[PDB]
Symmetry: C3
Subunit: 495 residues, 3 copies
């Protein structure tokens, strides 16, 4: 009966006919279709967004996404500890909700539960049922978490969660959210986040990267489609002055982007980017930037060396540093923007080659693992598969040397920003002129942008070692210049 459907749903016909999934009957994925025909287009069919339906025919992709592994060093790894990825986090992000809890990432299957349970999300409201002993459970959100209710309080939490956060954790609102989270769907940017979490049962769906109608490689993230549309010729995924994306607009309500050829750069960039998904402040007037404003669901697609200019051009910053008052940018996991134009990218390698390598299942069917891999833990498939001359030690050696050298500059930029911050408080206290203190704030802005990008980014330089060195040494230079300007000023007091 698809022809009857197709009379009214012509884009679906275009994706589905003569495709890999051509023969799949509609009722496989959609329930209540008879009521939809009979009663008309008031009675919408039900589209349950759900991995297990793809799993029925794609079991190795489904099993590997859900497989439970246990890293013997644990998870919930706070970054802000002496031996961690961001040892001076509490000082350098003073004034930001990340200081309440920010841990290293873990597996994809945990993404909703970890978003909802982290100390910075919603005041500790949502917790794992049964506590720590069930921290490794996968599946449905509300089988794993419980809701302690709106009036419960837990000490040293924050309330940074909002609806836009969910757009990088699940495909469950694909039909229930208007492009950008503008008003008109069941939920939008201004929704109460605690109404929204109830509807998220599942982590990133299979449909996030694969069209259900015709199995075409795709993107569904609003912010990512929008950024590419803004900059169709020069954006990080472009080639030859265009990008391999066709935007399909459904009813004026929501878009997808279909690509002729798999580009896991774009598919992983639906989440692995710097973004704004939060309220902020305007640099010019200091006016609030609320969820009313499109700037609160936004993807720059710019790297470390471009981002301070970019946020100044859209008159936006995230928080004032608690000590210096500097108008800082908060950075988050810019892996796509870092990877852009690195040695591997310019070689045509994509994220999935190192992070979703080929493994054999079952009997012995070849597939891309959909439990994403930490390359250092799997160098034979993530690296040696292509670098056939490498031994596992060599692969490890190369990953660690680059991170070693990058980390040395990261720790040195932190030492310098801490010096900047300590010098500034001294300079204040001895009331050095607000003019001078303001020159120092620009120094902080610059040194912070060129530093925090790399604690937020998760490769410690491996994704782009040149850009990391350039950025971090820029940060150091910025901070030592601020420290010299302030000390010059502090002397000039009793002068």
């Amino acid at each position: 009966g698809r022809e009857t459907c197709y009379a009214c749903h012509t884009e679906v016909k275009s994706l589905k006919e003569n495709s890999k999934h051509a023969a799949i009957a509609c009722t496989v994925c959609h329930d209540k279709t008879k009521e939809h025909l009979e009663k008309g287009p008031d009675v919408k069919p039900v589209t349950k967004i759900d991995q297990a339906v793809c799993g029925s025919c794609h079991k190795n992709q489904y099993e590997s996404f859900y497989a439970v592994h246990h890293d013997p060093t644990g998870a919930r790894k706070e970054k802000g500890i002496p031996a961690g990825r961001s040892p001076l986090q509490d000082k350098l992000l003073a004034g930001h909700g990340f200081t309440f809890e920010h841990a290293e990432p873990r597996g994809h299957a945990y993404m909703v539960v970890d978003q909802f349970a982290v100390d910075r999300f919603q005041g500790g409201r949502y917790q794992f049922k049964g506590g720590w002993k069930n921290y490794d459970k996968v599946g449905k959100t509300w089988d794993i978490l419980e809701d302690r209710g709106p009036n419960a309080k837990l000490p040293e939490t924050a309330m940074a969660g909002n609806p836009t956060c969910i757009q990088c954790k699940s495909s469950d609102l694909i039909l229930q959210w208007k492009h950008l989270g503008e008003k008109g769907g069941k939920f939008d940017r201004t929704s109460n986040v605690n109404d929204v979490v109830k509807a998220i049962n599942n982590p990133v769906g299979c449909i996030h990267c694969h069209d259900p109608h015709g199995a075409q490689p795709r993107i569904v993230r609003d912010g990512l489609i929008a950024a590419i549309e803004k900059d169709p010729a020069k954006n990080i995924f472009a080639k030859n002055g265009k990008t391999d994306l066709k935007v399909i607009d459904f009813r004026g309500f929501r878009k997808i982007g279909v690509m002729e050829k798999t580009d896991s750069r774009m598919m992983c960039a639906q989440c692995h980017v710097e973004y704004n998904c939060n309220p902020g402040t305007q640099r010019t007037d200091g006016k609030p930037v609320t969820f009313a404003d499109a700037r609160t669901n936004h993807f720059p697609l710019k790297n470390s060396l471009q981002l301070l200019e970019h946020y100044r051009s859209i008159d936006f910053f995230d928080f004032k540093h608690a000590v210096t008052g500097a108008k800082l940018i908060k950075f988050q996991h810019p892996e796509a923007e870092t990877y852009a134009g690195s040695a591997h990218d310019k070689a045509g390698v994509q994220c999935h080659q190192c992070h979703m390598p080929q493994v054999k299942g079952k009997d012995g069917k070849k597939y891309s693992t959909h439990g994403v891999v930490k390359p250092i833990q799997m160098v034979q498939e993530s690296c040696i598969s292509c670098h056939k001359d490498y031994t596992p030690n060599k692969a490890k050696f190369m990953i660690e040397t680059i991170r070693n050298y990058t980390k040395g500059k990261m720790r040195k930029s932190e030492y310098w920003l801490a010096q900047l911050i300590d010098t500034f408080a001294v300079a204040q206290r001895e009331g050095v002129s607000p003019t001078i203190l303001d020159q120092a704030r620009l120094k902080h802005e610059e040194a912070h942008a060129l530093w925090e990008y790399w604690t937020a980014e998760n490769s410690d330089g491996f994704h782009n070692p040149e850009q990391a060195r350039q950025s971090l040494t820029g940060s150091i230079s910025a901070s030592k210049a601020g420290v010299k300007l302030l000390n010059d000023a502090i002397m000039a007091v009793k002068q």
Copy 2:
């Protein structure tokens, strides 16, 4: 001839007859008994306190206690290093003898030698014979250590050792120390520690936890029996408004506590607790608290959330912080008080199930290992034995996740106390009012009590994750409140 003995030693008869050790002749453990009969009760028999006599019939318990293992990461692990368990120790304990040396614990067989040789004990007087190459030797104290004499000095040492320390290192003074170390035995609290160390040949004896007369599970520690007697209904080991302990008082001179059923919580709490075993100061008048005072050999049996109130109620603190002058409590290894009322305790699990698991000896006799185990290093017997569904990775994952999350809050509380301490010195220097500085000291008291308990405790949260989170976030809140009060005050100067 035991009947003749029994005419005069009626408690022994009560422990020994119809027991597991009924048939053991007295002369097995006691020498000079004929002179005792013949010459009378002036000539006391000799009771050599000594593991090797139990070993003669209990070889697997004896061999496993003495077995030498070599951890390839070494021992003598100072806590106060950037990657260690207490990275800000030197700043936060400024003014306390722990700043001279405080290392992580190692095996039981080393306990006397490590107490005597640590840099904080007695000015470096006692050293390992032959130096580092014999650091792993077990056995008799004075076969392993040498006495460089009373006038030798070693730089950057302290002289914190006293007799009461020995009561958690050996059973060797069981007959030679009057309850609490009151005057009347060969040694008491006011003895010169260098007279006492000469009499300690052996680490914790087999008799510390097992009655020699009838093999009944027991405690011998004075401080522990006393605390339970103070609080027989509500103490951490109680149940149903009483505790499973019968106190046996010998001649008015020394007590034991026998339990009808093995409770390794109590048996390990003879040492693994917070204690006072040191001189201190009175909070009200600032008067010294010397060894004359019973407060110097004392067990609170209270957890992190109760201890500041408890030490205020007995008008006692350990040291003024070198910078802030805050009247701090010094905390030590409160493992029993932490474990109380945690998930495993409420499940009826005891310390020995994870730390003394079942192993097979010899031929293949089943026994509890008496070389106490670090569970993460032995998850198959310490964890999987009960959690039969766990893989070794899962067990490790659970231990490390909890420690990971706990440690993130510990490091964040340290960042905050360091901020408190740095802010205070600023506030002083700019002479903010001693009234305000005093409000800040209370903040320090509170934030320190809720922080240092967890560096002293050895599980990094695993023993009680809820109480750890509650305490540490309390510390943070306390410190950020102090820092806000002081900064408010520091501005109010040039105001």
Copy 3:
């Protein structure tokens, strides 16, 4: 024809005849000898300094020196990171070029390339060809590095490289450098370093430690021969009031030192020592000390407890600390001076026994490995070979316990110097008297000398645990004394 040569080269005859290499024809190592005879001693023969000629008859020594290994934790390990060997490097060495980059050592075959490429050498001018993916390549310098040219700049670099540096990286200038780098050879101390690097093709040559003419164990380093000649009776390698070295002086131009018996202490001390190879300042007048001055290529051969006195006696220091102005000594890898008079040295063990242990090659020929070994990574040959009762765990345990205890004192001395430095800036700012500030500078001098020696030295105490404890506790004492003097002074302001 050697007799004809010998008529004019009589020292060579003395080394070569009746030796292990007696039969080797001259033309094996020297080309153009006929032109030298025919045209005379204007046409010098060519002596290509080159491992591969020794390799032709000594293949196992050559292969093991060049073998490529890949440490899976990587290389380029910056010291100045929280978990590294010198976590407070940026603060404590403020004002020195080491703050731009100082990493842990790696294999011998990398020594030239790492000297030329490090961020502190020559402004980033020299880089690995092909970047990170060729960081593990060995062989010829200029097959591995490229020269970006004199006008290229890279941010956050330094320009500390000079010709004297090369003397601890290669044997390539053995015939082209006059003793001490005095003027007269192709290169000397005042040469432009960028003229010199072009002539260094190879790392340390086989000839650095082995005479080519007669295979005698030897030294070629100018600074080392000179120090031993200064102090022939009492120097660290002496015995019975002399040293086992015969100095051979060729034409007044360059010296070797031949030893009757292998002493790898001396042979490794050609580089593994504290040295001055840099310009400096005079303590008395503050006058520059330039390459004109012999003090710029100099070996003290003194340990941690002697070096401050030694540098004061030759009126030399390296840099003023950027904050305190203290006239500091910069220390570098004093492994020979530390090892002197330690337990292993007094037992007659030499560096090569632990670092070049016996291995079997090829078929199964026994040899000393010439890829120098990190003992902890090879305890069976580096330790158990002599300590036959040791298990690999025990060996590891002993190395790590000593480093553990040593590191605890190192981190505590760093905490104290940082306190000194922070206190001093406070004391300045509140202008405490330059007299008092000067007493503090002496405190800094002393605490720095007794601290930085051990971050520079590479064993973390294992080479000499007693001297390490003595030095580091001396540093702590020095710093806490400075901190007390300054605080006493800072109070005495508003007094």
